[PDB]
Amino acid sequence: VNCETSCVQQPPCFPLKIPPNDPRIKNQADCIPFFRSCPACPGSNITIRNQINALTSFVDASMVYGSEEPLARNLRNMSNQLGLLAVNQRFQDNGRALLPFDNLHDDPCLLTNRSARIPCFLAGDTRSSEMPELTSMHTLLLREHNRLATELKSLNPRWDGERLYQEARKIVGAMVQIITYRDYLPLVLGPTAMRKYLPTYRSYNDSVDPRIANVFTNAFRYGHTLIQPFMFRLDNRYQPMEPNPRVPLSRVFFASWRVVLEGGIDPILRGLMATPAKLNRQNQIAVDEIRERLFEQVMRIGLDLPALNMQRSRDHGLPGYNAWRRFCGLPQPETVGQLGTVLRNLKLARKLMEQYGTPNNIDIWMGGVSEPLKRKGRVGPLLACIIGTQFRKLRDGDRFWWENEGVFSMQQRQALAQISLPRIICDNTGITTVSKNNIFMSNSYPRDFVNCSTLPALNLASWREA
Amino acid sequence: VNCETSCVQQPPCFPLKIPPNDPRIKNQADCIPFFRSCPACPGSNITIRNQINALTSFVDASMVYGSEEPLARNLRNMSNQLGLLAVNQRFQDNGRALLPFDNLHDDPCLLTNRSARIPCFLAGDTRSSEMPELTSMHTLLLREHNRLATELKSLNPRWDGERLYQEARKIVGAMVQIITYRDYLPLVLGPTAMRKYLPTYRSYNDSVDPRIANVFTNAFRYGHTLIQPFMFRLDNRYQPMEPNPRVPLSRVFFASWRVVLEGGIDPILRGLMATPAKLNRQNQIAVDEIRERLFEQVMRIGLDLPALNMQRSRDHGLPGYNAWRRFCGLPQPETVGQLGTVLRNLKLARKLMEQYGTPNNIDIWMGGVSEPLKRKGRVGPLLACIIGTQFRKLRDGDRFWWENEGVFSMQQRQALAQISLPRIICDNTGITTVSKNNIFMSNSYPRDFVNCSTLPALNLASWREA
Amino acid sequence: AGNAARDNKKTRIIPRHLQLAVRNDEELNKLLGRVTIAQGGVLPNIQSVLLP
Amino acid sequence: PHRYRPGTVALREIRRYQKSTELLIRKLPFQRLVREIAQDFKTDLRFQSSAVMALQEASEAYLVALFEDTNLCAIHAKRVTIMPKDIQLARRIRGERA
Amino acid sequence: RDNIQGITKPAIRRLARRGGVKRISGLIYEETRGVLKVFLENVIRDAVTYTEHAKRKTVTAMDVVYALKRQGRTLYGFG
Amino acid sequence: CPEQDKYRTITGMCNNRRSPTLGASNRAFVRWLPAEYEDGFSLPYGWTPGVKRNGFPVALARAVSNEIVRFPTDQLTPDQERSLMFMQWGQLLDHDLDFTPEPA
Amino acid sequence: CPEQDKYRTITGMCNNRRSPTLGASNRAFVRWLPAEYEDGFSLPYGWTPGVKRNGFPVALARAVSNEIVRFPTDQLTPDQERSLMFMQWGQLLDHDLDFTPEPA
Ligand SMILES: *[C@@H]1O[C@H](CO[C@@H]2O[C@@H](C)[C@@H](O)[C@@H](O)[C@@H]2O)[C@@H](O[C@@H]2O[C@H](CO)[C@@H](O[C@@H]3O[C@H](CO[C@H]4O[C@H](CO)[C@@H](O)[C@H](O)[C@@H]4O)[C@@H](O)[C@H](O[C@H]4O[C@H](CO)[C@@H](O)[C@H](O)[C@@H]4O)[C@@H]3O)[C@H](O)[C@H]2NC(C)=O)[C@H](O)[C@H]1NC(C)=O
Ligand SMILES: *[C@@H]1O[C@H](CO[C@@H]2O[C@@H](C)[C@@H](O)[C@@H](O)[C@@H]2O)[C@@H](O[C@@H]2O[C@H](CO)[C@@H](O[C@@H]3O[C@H](CO[C@H]4O[C@H](CO)[C@@H](O)[C@H](O)[C@@H]4O)[C@@H](O)[C@H](O[C@H]4O[C@H](CO)[C@@H](O)[C@H](O)[C@@H]4O)[C@@H]3O)[C@H](O)[C@H]2NC(C)=O)[C@H](O)[C@H]1NC(C)=O
Ligand code: HEM
Ligand code: HEM
Ligand SMILES: *[C@@H]1O[C@H](CO)[C@@H](O)[C@H](O)[C@H]1NC(C)=O
Ligand SMILES: *[C@@H]1O[C@H](CO)[C@@H](O)[C@H](O)[C@H]1NC(C)=O
Ligand SMILES: *[C@@H]1O[C@H](CO)[C@@H](O)[C@H](O)[C@H]1NC(C)=O
Ligand SMILES: *[C@@H]1O[C@H](CO)[C@@H](O)[C@H](O)[C@H]1NC(C)=O
Ligand SMILES: [Ca+2]
Ligand SMILES: [Ca+2]
Ligand SMILES: [Cl-]
Ligand SMILES: [Cl-]
């Protein structure tokens, strides 16, 4: 009953069936491998099936420190008392830290390069080894934590390893929260949805449920519409970096050897900073790299990311488009004319009506990404509603929110208010020219790029204990 | 470990610990037997513990027909094709039907008075065996269903057993809904609460959840404060019936032999109709009969109903009083004075403060029944909010609601709007004088009692199939 | 205002929709507190004590 | 002879007039009152129609807000009947007659 | 010239109904007429002052708008 | 389940056509508020002695009933505007709505 | 849960002192709407062939992606107000928040 090799629909396999005249798969007997999500408690005929969340729902940088005690202990440097995290013992990025290698029985990392023999990376999340941009983020956060711990050890020699680790982790989590709720969410939701669903912080509700909604795991996948079909690497002058300046995405999945042996994470960060994203249009939703050739090297056949999204929404038993429009307080179309009016694209309404037959059956992801984008935003009203509600609950329902009283001192809060992802990139890498404020908006060199020295630094003097 | 005889805190036993200087239990090593409710899916360390509802949440008279296929099949009169319900084959109430006898390995009804050897009655619920008034209700509903089936067969000779049974069940369920939502609930919630939480019926939400809330099972126990300590029987002249006109409640638990051998259900219904209920007061909450001698004859030791309610609320993991006050949008007291103003009782607030320590820890039942009663109601604002929300969800989320379009014809609804409980009582029993309109409010004889030849009968002419 | 007009099944924005938009938003109501909008009406609100 | 309760039609009117945007005062009497009042400041005065309309809108909004405050005052005194003392108290607290 | 009576009792009742008033006393109408007269006197006096300053014999909507704005009663919809 | 029906299913299945389970028998309760257990998920408050709820010790249910609920029976007052029919119909409706099973 | 703590726990427990399991790891999701399965509780839509959803046949996911999602790559529209940093931080935040395990 192995799902990756057999197309028989036996649990837990839920393979995707190939429609006739498929452009890529010419044999209907074949299928897309698919695994059903683990039930909350298996074998129960009384409870409605529910899925498990394996990570802490809070924005606490659990992708760097982990969400389980054994993994968190294994991610630390126990050979000393400076409270550092474990780094790579074999490779370095121009004298800087690298993520430690991870040992799994079935490692997809060595399949992309059978000559490099570079295994997957070890981090707080098992998905950190997709794709060199995410690995660059994880390495940057690791380096930032190590630098923060070093500076704290310099300021307070009396503190022990556990205290240094906890304080550095606290600062990193506060930094992640600040960057997320100050730079990212306003660009995602837009000012209208940001003000409607995420008002001014007041205090800590203990009555707000901080759990992650089941629909959120499929509504936050709107980012699959922002994926460019290439990976870009730039040199110190922000010019294309030879060789391989533009690499197809199908050749970078689970390829850690590109991070290791191809110049480190500096070109990847430069490409992320100085390259425009892909706009979500109703006739241009997702590129063919993730739609036809996803995980092509490490699998027997390429996957279909939007198809996987909708099959997962069906697997999770999520309600349809109309149910979620009703949930968010939005009008629910019933005919093709009403759907066209709602979507502002009549031809797309005809296509959706032909495929599904009724708006109630439209999958949550498809309806969310087919809606026109909000002004100064990148999600539709339904997706904006869902995301804003989830993040408002994650913010108000968190006891260790950085703005909550007792977590950080007033001087510490003011010092943390001066942080920026550009400053972190300046500090933890060899990049000297960095985009200006709102790093998620600046994408053209050198119009919105400044020197790294003009960025204010984080003043840790408020953390000195006496 | 048997929770009935042992006093150890091993699963599934959660016995009640005896405080020092108990007025009845002088042994501190003794305990009150208690069974933890069955979990929704057992043995799981992932899911939070949840309980099981063994009945249909809808108001469909499932106490008469059952919520399971085999029980419903066993409850029918399958010896013919008249679509009737099974009746007792050994005893009759002056020529009228009785509930069929049940067959249990352990029968609590037999322990009450062994010479008669009368087992528990079999009906749509397992708890009909407690109380001669409840048994009288079940017998009355069974007789009403049989009479409806006979009348429908007389009107439509071509109908088979299944159609007759289904139509009679439909009419009985509609009658139950009408009586519940027209006569009972206004006298519970009061005028303002009924208007706020149960507005006029409009249409059928299929998006309203009709599930019974976990807190509702403990909040609806407010009727334990309306229990009189005795059982009364009046004859046809509404005078006390010798012998035993006023019998202690501790001698009627599971005493079906009283129903069988002491005049049937007519005196019981007369006693229900012609006596006043107990008034819930902040210093007169619950009587001693259900407080010290509950199930005294059958169990090894008399239980205590309010403590059972508190222990069940703790077992189900229900939040405290302040959490439910916040849930209903009501002010949440935090000190003794604020609780005193909330309860309009400083002494009761002081006693609650001494017992619990904080209003956040007050059990839902205790706090709810400690609140002052609403105007023309019998519950406080919190209990009124919970009950109104639950019943609004039940009414709006029911597809087969009697007022819903397509369930009944206009003539059928016009006929059904005329039904009343006193009419059912007269049609199905030998009582020729019954209370006036709003039987739940009339409790004085002969002021509020009329000859029931003056009450209009239900007209089934609209049910005839042309 | 456009959201309010859509909630009323209307294609155009009239002053009633502007008043509904302003008075239903706490911050906009605070900003336009001493401002009267012509042909805007008032927010539907009946005191609880006056209900039957 | 179907007669409603002494409070049903009042609530119906409250719901009807809180959902509309029309003007509750007849235009011609209000115009005549405005001209009569303006006669005390300058004789031989001409009025634009928009001026009278603006005056009517402002007066209606002011009266509606004053009546809301008066209803709050009456409810404070454990009453449902609107009385002149409620209007006087509202005007004082607002700062008009204070 | 008795035009304050042109604001009839049903008109005051309608204005109170828009304000959420359920029951009205019989003496409220005279008080409302007086309040309306005072408010109109103030606003019209300010508007007429604005008109005289402009050397005009016609009261425009802008004069009324400015008069209302001077009293902290800004009106939107007339300029 | 059938697209067209005329009567209720005895179990309650497919009363809500979108989610047939909703309202059926032998199904878990719905939670209006998250559960508050001693250990977080399964243990009730008062299971292990010495564990306090919200910083305060857990009171015995029997003690609370003895202190607050108890009152002399002879001082009972009747409800002039209600009858025992009221509470009997309340109990019948409760038995209509819900029933939480317990192990044998 | 300790009465006083200065830092978060790795597993996320004891963040909410009333319900300590709220937001912790290895816990079931919260459902904002009741689930909609083929049989009601476990079977996803499209599992058994011939079963319609709300009176209409269930469309294949690959077919929907082929008909609607598919578009020629050469007509890609760059985003002049966003960078790839936006998408990368979105994915990093998603990996911070949620992860649904599957059998090996
Ligand atoms: C059929 O009933 C539907 C459900 O009815 C519910 O149950 C009945 C018995 C009533 O009690 C009813 O009031 C209940 O809603 C009903 O659809 C419902 O419509 C409402 C109003 O549009 C929806 O509420 C909106 O929901 C979202 C999200 O907020 C909710 O969810 C989050 C997460 O759970 C919570 O944190 C929130 O507190 C809410 O619970 C929002 O879009 C919205 O709030 C925002 O928007 C409004 C105006 O747009 C502002 O006033 C607010 O301040 C916010 O800015 C609402 O709260 C509700 O979700 C929806 N229910 C369901 C199940 O889909 C439907 O209208 C009825 N049908 C007919 C024909 O009448
Ligand atoms: C701390 O937050 C608490 C929870 O906050 C929620 O989550 C955050 C993230 C925000 O989205 C916030 O808006 C959310 O509410 C919050 O306590 C909350 O308070 C509200 C308002 O008092 C409560 O809603 C009330 O609930 C009941 C029941 O109705 C609800 O439940 C049923 C069953 O699910 C549904 O069918 C309904 O549609 C509702 O969802 C009612 O008593 C009440 O409605 C009636 O009463 C009000 C007057 O009070 C009238 O205006 C209405 O028209 C109705 O007549 C409310 O809907 C909510 O339950 C409660 N949540 C919790 C979890 O306890 C708290 O205020 C915040 N504290 C501070 C200090 O800010
Ligand atoms: C190199 C980049 C990416 C890869 C390899 C990738 C791939 C995948 C795959 C195969 C899944 C499982 C099936 C599914 O899609 O539901 C998944 C889930 C998910 N994706 Fe992506 N995607 C990428 C980009 C993104 C982006 C940009 C976002 C958000 C901005 C995102 C958000 C999510 C989320 C929240 C999940 C749910 C996690 C889970 O269900 O396990 N992904 N991703
Ligand atoms: C002669 C009358 C009554 C008897 C014998 C009785 C007895 C009981 C018992 C033994 C329980 C279970 C105890 C527990 O689980 O903690 C219970 C629970 C309950 N009672 Fe009563 N009670 C009576 C009156 C009432 C009334 C008048 C009402 C409502 C108006 C009511 C509503 C409930 C409800 C809803 C439950 C929940 C069921 C459960 O907990 O399993 N009861 N009753
Ligand atoms: C731990 O830190 C030391 C420096 O303090 C470094 O040399 C060593 O490599 C680190 N060990 C690991 C396993 O990362
Ligand atoms: C695999 O990695 C090696 C370096 O070890 C490199 O020379 C080679 O080109 C890589 N192969 C591919 C197909 O990229
Ligand atoms: C079925 O009904 C008939 C006729 O009323 C009756 O004689 C018979 O006893 C019933 N059967 C059962 C098993 O109750
Ligand atoms: C037990 O039942 C018999 C009739 O068989 C009756 O005479 C007797 O009084 C009953 N016992 C009690 C204690 O009521
Ligand atoms: Ca996290
Ligand atoms: Ca039922
Ligand atoms: Cl609950
Ligand atoms: Cl969900």
Author numbering:
A (entry chain L), B (entry chain N): 113 to 578
C (entry chain G): 66 to 117
D (entry chain A): 38 to 135
E (entry chain B): 23 to 101
F (entry chain M), G (entry chain K): 1 to 104
The publication says:
We describe how the oligomeric status of MPO governs both outcomes. MPO dimers interact with nucleosomal DNA using one protomer and concurrently dock into the nucleosome acidic patch with the other protomer. On the other hand, MPO monomers stably interact with the nucleosome acidic patch without making concomitant DNA contacts, explaining how monomeric MPO binds to and licences NETs to confer hypohalous acid production in the extracellular space.
One of its protomers binds to the acidic patch as observed above for the monomer and rMPO. This interface is characterized by charge complementarity between arginines of MPO and the negatively charged DNA backbone without specific, dominant single contacts. For dimeric MPO, this specific and probably tight binding positions the second MPO protomer to interact with the DNA at the crossover site, resulting in a clash of this MPO protomer with the nearby end of the nucleosomal DNA. To compensate for this clash, the DNA end can no longer associate with the nucleosome and unwraps, ultimately destabilizing the nucleosome enough to trigger its disassembly. Essentially, the MPO dimer induces molecular constraints and shifts the dynamic equilibrium of nucleosomes towards detachment of the DNA, driving nucleosome eviction.
